[PDB]
């Protein structure tokens, strides 16, 4: 009908990316917009862009930041959590606690991919090390997800600190299996 | 008018000022469909315009007729037009029926200059420049490499005095000097990619990808015009030195990119085939050993035996060849190649590597691109063939990207197959002694070969012509003579005649070798066509390549022999 | 209560996500959508005015990209709503046919949705009447019979499992747990269970039990 | 010391390799572990690219380095799958030059080599030891041994007083793996001048077992080692990777192996409105004319559908074709092409055949003195096509052995105390000449055919090809042959051999159409008409040599079902019935009327 079948009940990865790019990010403007034309946006705030000074930290939307970066008019400041030391600490936390998930940002995977593809020279640390750390974190979380999938039941279920992309990936299977279990239990009564 | 070497930045700024508006596109680029140098130059320009967010259209073109058609089909919103790889020799104003009055926008009496809605930029390496485009016309802008100021002052004065005008004697002298200037042949003086890189350096947008494209464009000329490559090599060396990181101690990473000046060899696809194949399917090796008969094969086997490389090891592919022999190859060549006269195989080339991927040299990359251009995959059939070639242009364009490596591998395989086919055709030509020798020139006509279809493309015919020129002609101590190569297609019943300039022995620095040899066949062909009546086609950009009807070749060759203007 | 364009965009995104992940058809935000359409019209006029008249090139690109993003969001939301209306035409018609029901399609749908619903229902009814229904006896000539062997009216799956993220008030229902964190308590009548939802925690709950919290905006579907 | 460094290097290669943004081997290992596939396939080009020193070490001493690689793979798998599993197998892929099987000699001892051949025999799976639990007879000392299957190991000679060899293996606590033996012959085209084909012994372990069937060309990557059965060693090959052009897994199982990209290529091809013409043109492109025989060969390759009734009766679903014609008709070339294109096929000469050759043979084992059954062309070509050239040359005795195979699709053996019923579901394509070498129209058909009616009735379609001297056809054939001698459409008018073979396999494993009532009515009417015509055509002097029985009705049904299967159509309509009837009239009734 109006909506395709693959877009029903779930978001496509492009939709998840679109949702992610609405979040703020820190940049270093390479031009001086502030006065001592004017952005007039209706979805986000335009005060930050107008009051932008060279080599001064400012906050804008991620998609606007990428658009500026394409023109080489701003250097994206990578998130603090995307450092080698912080990723190592998160890996250690994951290893020490086999029952919970590390408190990573809900958009860590999507943001990491976007920044690796678009902003490669902005990172202070080598890109390959960050890729390896992210891969290891992903495998550990996959092991935890597989272990936790054994407790599906007709009642609720809790998955704390799980990111948005992982939830999007797992939504079909988990939802359908739990729905069928609930249907069987309801029929039993 | 023309722009000097330092005016490239001004021309680029003019293009930015005029043809830049996000509302609609106002920039169109016309590209020669069968020129690797033009392909690389247009790729560099496309990346540069993408950086600045300039809306543009890229249209491959084959021949002057298609240029006229496409220009007639152009819209009125095109402020600037780019002619990359052609247009230098012909009169664009006269050819394109461009009348400046119909193209003007505003005229200022005080300024003395007129503004025109459309502008045309010519990036042509061929010579001689057409003085109408350089000194007469204002709409046509030419990207000169300094030739006009270096050597065309006297012709400039003569043309200006002709325009400004007992006087009959002065007019006679000026028109005589103009005719003498116009009487010379055509050659290539510089690489367009070099000029684009000079522009980028002027505006400071030079990086490693641009340098790689410049290297490819420059080395595309090595096969034919080695003097240009030798002149431009030191600058490429210096630029590679400048752009390379000082420290290489860091271990390889998946994203590491290397660009080294390593010893290259005059061998065919050494790194993507076997050593035996590399020596076998090389123009220089075959020329210096005559590998088209059994004696050449015996000599090659004897050479390989004296180098200490087993025949089984030599035929092994490059990747899996024994590492000891691969490491010693440089020394082995240093001590053994001199005996068999292959001392020229030693050379320095550019090799590019990506992290955890194979390493490919510039010559091999150019060979793959040319193979993709050639075999990648009455008037109606001709149009369909030219459409197929235009389509192949885009496969070649895609191969230039680092993400599309499968296309590069396919091009390498097609290059191997094409070289094998050309070798077979050359063996057939030489065994049959089909190369007739007339005092003025040599002649070779293909009529009943096994692979006649492959030679409808001008590039494949030029490849075969180069193979034949290097073999048994560059050697033998025979006086240099231009060669005529013709092929036949039954599906259309017409010929593809291609004149080829002679070449001095490769790698023989001499005063006479320093001087170039011009290609005079365009003038003779045009004169014969105008005088005769045979419905010949001179629509190809390379004026030396024409299409001749089946019946008229014999009279055409008779007139060519009797003309004596070759 | 209008606040600012940013809040309107945030509410539009929340509504889009909830509609995409919700089993039922949620009420239409009439005022918010009217404001958004008017703002889009004014912004398009402003962009045209600026364009008609090089430092100003980047801002214009930003305006155009933002307009495209907002248009895409609204388009996806409306198309999802139309698909849901397609899947629940008979349900609704039954809602309207009942007078004791509190809900009315005028509040539950926009005018365009009402027109689309009526037109599609009429067209499909004409097709099925000219094809199949006219041959069956009078007893089987009703497209919506609830007394048959299988009910023909497809109601929403009330107990569908959905992902939620507890955010709390932008609270009488709020209470603290043993560990000192704010929490919500909901019941599952079928299983006679009590589930404690902790603020900031992701859960996979049944839609029916979380319906009130979702409507009050205390939780949001992921 | 050095072993630990080698293991660390292999682990780093596994955990660090990447060509764009996917860690190929890490993800591959995780995916393999997910489906309980404890192995890892490594492309040697990637290993060379990552670090040439590792490749040099691997090539220098494969038998000592590969186990370290397996240990590294196991450690990485444990890291990636278990949140704090037998030894994993390493399978190699390479593009190095293939060494002829006969060129393998002393110079290639203990080296990784690539070669191709034909599998002629496979053994029964055996059991090897990996983890052994042992105990001493006297002091009862418990000990364990870990064994790798790469041979340059034994029970300790001295206990840890106890006599020599004091340890006895405890079986219930040990772990074993699977092992198989294969015999690889050299390709017929690669054999030297005037030499018999050479055999080579090969071994495979764990996940490389049950991968090949006898009679299929394969490419093998392995180590050229030697084992002492006194100054000599018996050569053998330790298989490290098997690459074949036939999906053996999908042939012996109802399971079908085809990538999603394949499945969707074969659906698009089936959607072509004129696939029949493409396949007809794709068979024997170098042979002029013979369109009807090419269509018959297409039908034979596709085959019909087999039905098993509730009462147990089974109906044949294979199509047999006979070619009786004059010399120079290109029958043998068609047979060779059929053998080349079919997924499974055996080319045999009637002259050079026997009863025991073509069914199964009782063979006594030299050692055990026990009788076993080997297999012949109709067991080796099970599920395929048997091309019996020179059909006429075959002795009566030999010939008579084929009837049950053709009709009942089984082989019954009662010899040397062996009572069994083998399975031979094959299609027979035979070529033969008349009694006098040409079909003399002066003599009656009965005098031109020495075949008894019993054998002829089993052939679904019989083609009597007569060479007629027509100037136009002669000139056309001469031009075609001259062009062939002196001399690639691939524009949708023809598909290569590999694609056709894959499509044949897919169609056979996917579709089994059925006749519609209209098809049945039309077929019954045509059968009645044909039988009435045959009865009318009879002459008092002789009875029809070419028979028309219920088998011909079954053959026509099979042809219709094969035509329907050609397009992946679940149902066969009158459109296919018409083509089947036309083919039958063009071949069998054409032969009978004469
Ligand atoms: N129509 C044809 N097109 C191409 N080649 C043909 C054709 N007819 C015959 N030939 C050639 O004629 C030769 C006949 O040999 P072939 O073994 O194929 O004959 P045959 O029909 O099996 O006869 P025989 O009964 O004598 O064994 C082959 O080389 C075949 O290539
Ligand atoms: Mg024969
Ligand atoms: Zn003991």
UniProtKB/Swiss-Prot annotation, chain A:
Q: Which Pfam families match?
A: PSF2_N, Sld5
Q: Which Gene3D superfamilies is this protein grouped with?
A: 1.20.58.1020, 3.40.5.50
Superkingdom of origin organism: Eukaryota
Q: What is its main location?
A: nucleus
Recorded hits in SUPFAM superfamilies, A to Z, give: GINS helical bundle-like, PriA/YqbF domain
Q: Per the UniProt entry, what is one GO biological process?
A: double-strand break repair via break-induced replication
What's in the GO CC field? CMG complex; DNA replication preinitiation complex; GINS complex; nuclear replication fork; nucleus
Protein's cellular compartments: Nucleus
Q: Tell whether Nucleus is among the UniProt keywords.
A: yes
Q: Which keywords, in A-to-Z order, does the entry hold? A: DNA replication, Nucleus
The Swiss-Prot or TrEMBL record describes its family as follows: Belongs to the GINS2/PSF2 family.
Quaternary structure and partners: Component of the GINS complex which is a heterotetramer of SLD5, PSF1, PSF2 and PSF3. Interacts with PSF1 and SLD5.
The role this protein plays is:
Functions as part of the GINS complex which plays an essential role in the initiation of DNA replication by binding to DNA replication origins and facilitating the assembly of the DNA replication machinery.
Q: What is this protein called?
A: DNA replication complex GINS protein PSF2
What is the organism field in this record? Saccharomyces cerevisiae (strain ATCC 204508 / S288c)
Q: Could you tell me the gene encoding this protein?
A: PSF2
From Swiss-Prot, chain B:
Q: Which Pfam families match?
A: CDC45
Classification via InterPro entries: CDC45
Q: Where in the cell is it found?
A: Nucleus
Name a single GO biological process.
DNA replication initiation
GO terms under cellular component? CMG complex; DNA replication preinitiation complex; nuclear replication fork; nucleus
What GO MF annotations does this protein's record show? chromatin binding; DNA replication origin binding; single-stranded DNA binding
Q: Where are the transmembrane segments?
A: none
Supply the alphabetized keyword list.
Cell cycle, DNA replication, Nucleus, Phosphoprotein
Quote the record's miscellaneous comment: Present with 1730 molecules/cell in log phase SD medium.
Share what the entry says about its subunit structure, partners included: Assembles into a complex with MCM5/CDC46. Interacts with MCM10.
Q: What does this protein do?
A: Required for initiation of chromosomal DNA replication. Acts at the origin of replication. Also has a role in minichromosome maintenance.
| Family to which the UniProt record says this protein belongs | Belongs to the CDC45 family.
Q: What is this protein called?
A: Cell division control protein 45
From Swiss-Prot, chain C:
The highest taxon in the source lineage is Eukaryota
Gene Ontology annotations of biological process type:
DNA-templated DNA replication; double-strand break repair via break-induced replication
Keyword terms, alphabetized: DNA replication, Nucleus
Location of this chain's protein in the cell: Nucleus
The entry's cellular-component GO terms read:
CMG complex; DNA replication preinitiation complex; GINS complex; nuclear replication fork; nucleus
Coarsely, its chief localization is: nucleus
Q: What is the effect of changing residue 84 to E?
A: In sld5-2; temperature-sensitive mutant. Defective in DNA replication
Q: Which family does it belong to?
A: Belongs to the GINS4/SLD5 family.
Q: What does this protein do?
A: Required for DNA replication. Functions as part of the GINS complex which plays an essential role in the initiation of DNA replication by binding to DNA replication origins and facilitating the assembly of the DNA replication machinery.
How it assembles, according to the record, is: Component of the GINS complex which is a heterotetramer composed of SLD5, PSF1, PSF2 and PSF3. Interacts with PSF2.
Q: What is this protein called?
A: DNA replication complex GINS protein SLD5
Q: Which organism is it from?
A: Saccharomyces cerevisiae (strain ATCC 204508 / S288c)
Curated annotation (Swiss-Prot), chain D:
Query: Subunit composition?
Result: Component of the MCM2-7 complex. The complex forms a toroidal hexameric ring with the proposed subunit order MCM2-MCM6-MCM4-MCM7-MCM3-MCM5; loaded onto DNA, forms a head-head double hexamer. Interacts with CSM1.
Every MCM domain range: 275-482
Q: Which EC main class describes this enzyme?
A: hydrolase
InterPro entries in UniProt: MCM (IPR031327), MCM5 (IPR008048), MCM5_C (IPR054125), MCM_CS (IPR018525), MCM_dom (IPR001208), MCM_lid (IPR041562), MCM_N (IPR027925), MCM_OB (IPR033762)
Q: Which Gene3D superfamilies match?
A: 2.20.28.10, mini-chromosome maintenance (MCM) complex, chain A, domain 1, Nucleic acid-binding proteins, P-loop containing nucleotide triphosphate hydrolases
Kindly provide the name given to this protein in its UniProt entry: Minichromosome maintenance protein 5
- Residues that, per the record, bind ATP: 325-332
Q: Which gene is transcribed and translated to give this protein?
A: MCM5
